[PDB]
Amino acid sequence: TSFPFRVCELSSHGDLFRFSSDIQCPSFGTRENHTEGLLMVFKDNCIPYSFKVRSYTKIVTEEKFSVESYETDQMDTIYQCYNAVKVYVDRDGVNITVNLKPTGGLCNGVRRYASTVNCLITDMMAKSNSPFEFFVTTTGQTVEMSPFYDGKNTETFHERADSFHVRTNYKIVDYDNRGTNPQGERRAFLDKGTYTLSWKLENRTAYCPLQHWQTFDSTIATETGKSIIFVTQEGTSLFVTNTTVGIELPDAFKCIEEQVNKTMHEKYEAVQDRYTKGQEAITYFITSGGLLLAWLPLTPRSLATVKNNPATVQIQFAYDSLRRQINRMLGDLARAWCLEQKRQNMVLRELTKINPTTVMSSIYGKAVAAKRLGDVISVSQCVPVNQATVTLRKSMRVPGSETMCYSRPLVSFSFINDTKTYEGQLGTDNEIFLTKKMTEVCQATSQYYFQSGNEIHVYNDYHHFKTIELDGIATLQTFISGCGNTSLICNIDFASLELYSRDEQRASNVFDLEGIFREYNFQAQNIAGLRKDLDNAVSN
Amino acid sequence: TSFPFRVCELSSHGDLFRFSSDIQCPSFGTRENHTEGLLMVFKDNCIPYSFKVRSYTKIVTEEKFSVESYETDQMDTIYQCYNAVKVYVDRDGVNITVNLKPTGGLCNGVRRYASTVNCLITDMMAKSNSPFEFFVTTTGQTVEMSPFYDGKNTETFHERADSFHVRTNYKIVDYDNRGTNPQGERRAFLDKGTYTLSWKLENRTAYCPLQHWQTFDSTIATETGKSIIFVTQEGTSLFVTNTTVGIELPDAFKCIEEQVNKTMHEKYEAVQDRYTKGQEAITYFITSGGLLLAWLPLTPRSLATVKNNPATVQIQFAYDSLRRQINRMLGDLARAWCLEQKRQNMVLRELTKINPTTVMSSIYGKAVAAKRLGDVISVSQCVPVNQATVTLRKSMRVPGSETMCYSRPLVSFSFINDTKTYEGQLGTDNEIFLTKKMTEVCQATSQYYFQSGNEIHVYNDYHHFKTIELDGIATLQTFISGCGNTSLICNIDFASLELYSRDEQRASNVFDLEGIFREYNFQAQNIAGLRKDLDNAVSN
Amino acid sequence: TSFPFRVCELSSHGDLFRFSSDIQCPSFGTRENHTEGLLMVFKDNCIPYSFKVRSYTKIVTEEKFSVESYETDQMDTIYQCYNAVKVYVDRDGVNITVNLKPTGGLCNGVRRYASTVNCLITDMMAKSNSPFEFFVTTTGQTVEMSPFYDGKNTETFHERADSFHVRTNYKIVDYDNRGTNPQGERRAFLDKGTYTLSWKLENRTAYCPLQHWQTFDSTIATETGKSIIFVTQEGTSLFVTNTTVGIELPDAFKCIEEQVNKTMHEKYEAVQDRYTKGQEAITYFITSGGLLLAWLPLTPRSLATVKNNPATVQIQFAYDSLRRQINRMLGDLARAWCLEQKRQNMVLRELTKINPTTVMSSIYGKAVAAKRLGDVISVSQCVPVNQATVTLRKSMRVPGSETMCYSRPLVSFSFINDTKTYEGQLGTDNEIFLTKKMTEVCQATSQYYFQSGNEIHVYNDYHHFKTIELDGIATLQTFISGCGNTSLICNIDFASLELYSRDEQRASNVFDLEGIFREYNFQAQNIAGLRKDLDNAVSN
């Protein structure tokens, strides 16, 4: 499955996105003078430059400290360091050669080494996007420079110039290959006060700013005076061009010119029997969002020459009268689609307040850890756990609490290549939470169904009863079409009714957010009462 | 109204459904070679087998106990039982013949009888679905067998075989008809340790696995190599068939063969003037979701024979050129509909976390109690209350709390055929909650509008002011189209501004979930402070 | 920007709307006998009658009191009042002529004047809707009469008749123009016990009940026996008419007759070459929602006379066979649109529980303060603050709390024309909250991005780091199409993992509503434990 057992709440800081307010959907206005043509849509290119980075730090018990040049050489060559922080030493000892032992990193390709005072090394990935303004490490620390900054190149670099240096012919030793003496590299070093950071300088690579996105074989152009609106039959996509006369192609985009000549020729060749070219040269357009649109206008051949009114006039009139009706309908579909995207954006913005992790995982169709960092959402991979160790606990009653029960089953698991066993609670879709705070007052009778991939675990009275296939429980569609529409069963929790008849004040488990809201002001007044009573108890 | 006054939170466990992750929407790919034809869609049949069940239990003050065979005979014939639990007796008395009195059940057809130790009988419905793997009683107790299990039949039965027995020629007495001596039955008995359960064994009924769902009079079949995609013009429904050559009909489904011969002949007869049959026999297809699709391919007659280019060629070209364009548009509409259903499923999954009862009631268009039982939603009827007794309290200030007021109006009501009067708070759409915890700090001025079906109750200063028709308040659409778009009124709560200017720390009522979220961490730190201060007060 | 810095939570009571349950979408049923025609849709007219109102009150320390006729004359002419409340006087003094000083109102055109006992005047707007049943003042106080009630006119008036009077030739003085002696007016007075209210009686204006809404140039009418369903090609709008024979126009709507004659003639004149009129007179229809629909049926000219089968018959058959297919598709699009609106209404109803302010602001596309007043939503303008004074605080660590940090940046601001400086927290989209309760436990490392219009503020370690343009962070669409689809970075919060490995019980910041829900029952049990421990501490 694409949603394996995973811990997602450990994900600190990943790729950022924001919800676009003020999405604008055009009004077609005067809607005659449609013209057909090929549209190639080009999107800004993003290259995920992922590169291996070594982090060096001193941990002190908790203040942290960078590592100087002489000690980082000893770390990279011998994995030895010097037990002190510049002054106290571990166990209040004396400054001595202290040897780093290896330690598991939880991601693919992350390796930690850790020997009061503690030397620490972390091999880890960092990723950067096409503009190369910054790169984010697995720790979530962000560095405000290009990873290709050579120092002399004056490429984007906002950190302290004194903190950055580059050393040639640098030697680095692989921990289990200490005698192989690997080939030398050119390696950069950065001092951030909290930690030293080092990475290999790969001479910056070269790429073309625009990557091809879509080819729409027939599109309808509507000239609304200030803008051209392009309506695409494939999908329902709509493009608003802010200029009426197409711009000559900027030379930086000239890598496109071959691709457009090829795609236009290949696709026009399959269409020659139905259309003639309106222009000998492609017209280029730029959208406000920065998409480049390549437009080849085509004029349809009259049906007489496709390779009291007389028949031909009636046929051409009917054909043109229905083509225009289809074009109007496609335009209204594109406008409806634009408005629906505008409303989806708001719906997603609101659902992200309920749970960003699940919202994003549903958008992607794969497990992604999502964290709301104020007004931006960060998306990242979850921490994988090795699924052979994942075992649910058969009983979910809280040990040593006659009045408390777990509302989610306990899970025992181990991190990949980690011997230590950890315990947590099974969230939704094999998610594992490093918490045991999902508890509820033990009901006299309870039925709970928890889905763990292709199997559902059925718990009666907080004890594991059976495992059933997912097909044992109808999906929403099958439910509404099947016996979900029949006379629903009438249920009475007679125990709850008697309890309310005998103690109207009694507390009960909340089951939904709206119940939290309905209780909230009463609970806040209860807290205020606690505060006042405690202050009076202290005063007396 | 379909949303009468009701108590929904008493609903323990009803019909279960789950939100289907990984809904797959196909890509049409190579899109020529459309063919038209009739499509009959058949869906798996669900029969709601609802049957009357008698429950027997001993309640002890609270341990519960089943009832033996000799005492259940005395209950079913005389409604007498024996006051003891096998040992203590009610009022620490002595084992004696003790007579059950009748008691109201709150659902249609539920009747309770109840005389430390308490004999209890409950006539109640149980419902089961077409696979007959289990049946759920009104209490919410689920039994893991088919209600048609004859013991010897080896039909699905997972309970303890020692606990189940069947007795012939069993006699049962109706409480108010004790002299009528009803005809005998064959009745099954089950011991679940907590309770005995009994029901009449109706010889298992017979039915055909597939129920007809839809007939689509014209559909477009696209052969995408591995699958056939069926696009239906009525609605926007889409069906993905995992096989390219249609399977011969399984004999178990042969009940369909007459229905398909009839529907295909009846509907082709109205279409003969436009199409000819491509095949002499219907082709059957099965979807991954288990729908059976009956497909009659049709080939359209040329327009010449429907009962420099020459005219006929132009007419046929235009007709075929526009039919293909409509077919492409219908395919894109079906794909858009599939994606929109995929996104609706996520939206509903998230809104169910806000409030499943209201979400489900809106989906059904009728009052349904919905409870999230972990990862599955249970849907059931709400408990009806007799609407002649429902009276709102004219004042919603909390009695004996100068600083507290009710945020929802109080409701006095009686359960159907119950003399006892109960008091609660009016939730949304005539829902009644068995709680009075929806309270708020009394505002100096307040306006609240509560809708109770076709009338809105307007409360000024926590006192009932007037009742207005629902038409007195514009709907969202009428609002946005009417004066909602004008210059909105500018309001200043000057009292709130002065309060904040004079006590920046002062507490205020929360009005929405996002305000709960914004306060939550501060309230948690307040609770932690309470805990630390109380521990220090105890230590001193 | 349309979302300036603003305080929205001060908005007490504005225009009300409700979510329409039981939106009905028709079934087309028998679908032949389409007919084309022009449809004019007329909607009920709403006029926002906004008028200037003066409020008079005595504030007492806090009981409030109206002002008598002799003292209101002295307020309106000299802005003098008499320091007493009928008896105690400010500073326990003696009844004396006491002079009102001016004070800023926070809305455009609101002016307050305020000299134990405090005379108070408030010039403020009040707005009323077309039916003139009530008008709402800026304070949020609602008055149950028409503002055009002349006393003798017996126009809608539900307040106490003794409380209302009208005085001719009334003189009112402008505070800074005390010598100009403005022209007299006819002014009404109302005593509400809490406050006196006064406004100018402008003889009620006259208007026509129906305002033109839309003209749909081609629409499809389907006669479903009981109703006519109108499907409009522009947009996807659908109208259900409850009558099959159109009603003769009520005389009250006769103002429409000229507009319809003009629009029908102007639009038919552009269509004569394609259609002939089916009737010589427009047919009027009324929807259940009260829309008036003007219908001119048109019959299309045969293609022969638009100004073995023979060609003309084939051409007409093809044209009619495709027009019917387009009409069926438009009908299915209109039904899908109706169902989608029905589902949007539920989605919006649920999202309003998360945050009505943001939901409504997204619907309007402009900043609107929204407050849920039970089952109705009130919408109003937010209080503007003068944006030249808005300065974010560079540091968001809580002063004097080593363990607490602010989760939203602090904002210093001044109200328009107010010298006083106020401090609060920056909510979403330049919203300012008069609170400082959004706090969190200081994380060892934190990254937060807050958007403030066209700029994003980036805070590292609770200290302001940089400001970036909105284009520095990809929108959701650009994200999903760009590097958001690449291999996401794998992040480990190693500190969190160590903390959980060493103290499984440790508390953590909640980041979403579902985390509130997961913690809620455990926090409620913690509160209950606090209560029990405090009661035992008091008992001992």
Ligand SMILES: *[C@@H]1O[C@H](CO)[C@@H](O[C@@H]2O[C@H](CO)[C@@H](O[C@@H]3O[C@H](CO)[C@@H](O)[C@H](O)[C@@H]3O)[C@H](O)[C@H]2NC(C)=O)[C@H](O)[C@H]1NC(C)=O
């Ligand atoms: C603990 O013992 C280590 C043993 O290495 C001491 O490290 C030494 O630290 C000094 C500076 O305090 C280094 O001096 C350096 O010399 C190089 C030139 O070789 C120069 O480029 C540097 O800027 C610096 O002046 C020295 O190299 C370094 N290592 C050795 C081999 O002595 C460390 O200072 C002792 N102190 C603590 C904090 O316990």
Ligand SMILES: *[C@@H]1O[C@H](CO)[C@@H](O[C@@H]2O[C@H](CO)[C@@H](O[C@@H]3O[C@H](CO)[C@@H](O)[C@H](O)[C@@H]3O)[C@H](O)[C@H]2NC(C)=O)[C@H](O)[C@H]1NC(C)=O
């Ligand atoms: C309280 O008084 C009742 C009076 O009925 C006692 O019920 C009796 O219980 C015994 C078993 O303790 C029953 O014996 C049974 O005999 C039948 C055959 O007739 C056999 O099939 C059963 O397996 C069982 O051996 C007895 O029938 C039953 N009723 C009578 C009429 O005596 C009850 O035991 C007394 N005890 C308590 C718990 O207070």
Ligand SMILES: *[C@@H]1O[C@H](CO)[C@@H](O[C@@H]2O[C@H](CO)[C@@H](O[C@@H]3O[C@H](CO)[C@@H](O)[C@H](O)[C@@H]3O)[C@H](O)[C@H]2NC(C)=O)[C@H](O)[C@H]1NC(C)=O
């Ligand atoms: C404080 O001093 C003011 C000074 O104005 C007193 O106001 C006076 O109040 C009396 C009623 O208590 C007013 O009598 C009124 O006479 C008019 C006719 O001129 C009549 O229409 C009213 O119904 C009422 O009978 C009087 O006009 C008013 N002003 C003057 C100039 O004396 C006030 O009563 C003193 N008392 C308090 C509460 O401190």
